[PDB]
Amino acid sequence: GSMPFAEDKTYKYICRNFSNFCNVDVVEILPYLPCLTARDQDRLRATCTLSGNRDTLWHLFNTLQRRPGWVEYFIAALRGCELVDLADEVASVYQSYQPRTS
């Protein structure tokens, strides 16, 4: 979509609990998260080998936040790698910030 508002707030919200997401696999998320450009995901598949989680995950959120709508696919990213709890975390944010508006 266009104009990230709730999707922008989600970044700032999750940035507060980044430490909870610091226990995730960022590379496993990549094929489960198709809201970015291949280059963006490929970049994460570069930093992954350099750092692992932390730097990769930070750049993950940093690249995600500029894709207005990332949140929805991101739910399916954590949940796609059996990390339903981390999906729940984001889902509970987006449950408040524009959950369903149609």
UniProtKB/Swiss-Prot annotation:
It is found in: Mitochondrion outer membrane; Mitochondrion; Peroxisome. Changing C81S: Loss of palmitoylation. Residues 12-79 are annotated as: Required for interaction with NLRX1. A lipid is attached at C81 (S-palmitoyl cysteine). The phosphorylated pLxIS motif constitutes an IRF3-binding motif, leading to recruitment of the transcription factor IRF3 to induce type-I interferons and other cytokines. Changing W58 to A/E/R: Impairs filament formation and abolishes antiviral signaling activity. Present in T-cells, monocytes, epithelial cells and hepatocytes (at protein level). Ubiquitously expressed, with highest levels in heart, skeletal muscle, liver, placenta and peripheral blood leukocytes. There is a cross-link at K9, K12 (Glycyl lysine isopeptide (Lys-Gly) (interchain with G-Cter in ubiquitin)). The modification N-acetylproline is found at P4. Residues 12-79 form the CARD domain. It comes from the Eukaryota. Self-associates and polymerizes (via CARD domains) to form 400 nM long three-stranded helical filaments on mitochondria, filament nucleation requires interaction with RIGI whose CARD domains act as a template for filament assembly. Interacts with RIGI, IFIH1/MDA5, TRAF2, TRAF6 and C1QBP. May interact with FADD, RIPK1, CHUK and IKBKB. Interacts (when phosphorylated) with IRF3; following activation and phosphorylation on the pLxIS motif by TBK1, recruits IRF3. Interacts with NLRX1. Interaction with NLRX1 requires the CARD domain. Interacts with PSMA7. Interacts with TRAFD1. The pLxIS motif constitutes an IRF3-binding motif: following phosphorylation by TBK1, the phosphorylated pLxIS motif of MAVS recruits IRF3. IRF3 is then phosphorylated and activated by TBK1 to induce type-I interferons and other cytokines. Adapter required for innate immune defense against viruses. Acts downstream of DHX33, RIGI and IFIH1/MDA5, which detect intracellular dsRNA produced during viral replication, to coordinate pathways leading to the activation of NF-kappa-B, IRF3 and IRF7, and to the subsequent induction of antiviral cytokines such as IFNB and RANTES (CCL5). Peroxisomal and mitochondrial MAVS act sequentially to create an antiviral cellular state. This is Mitochondrial antiviral-signaling protein.
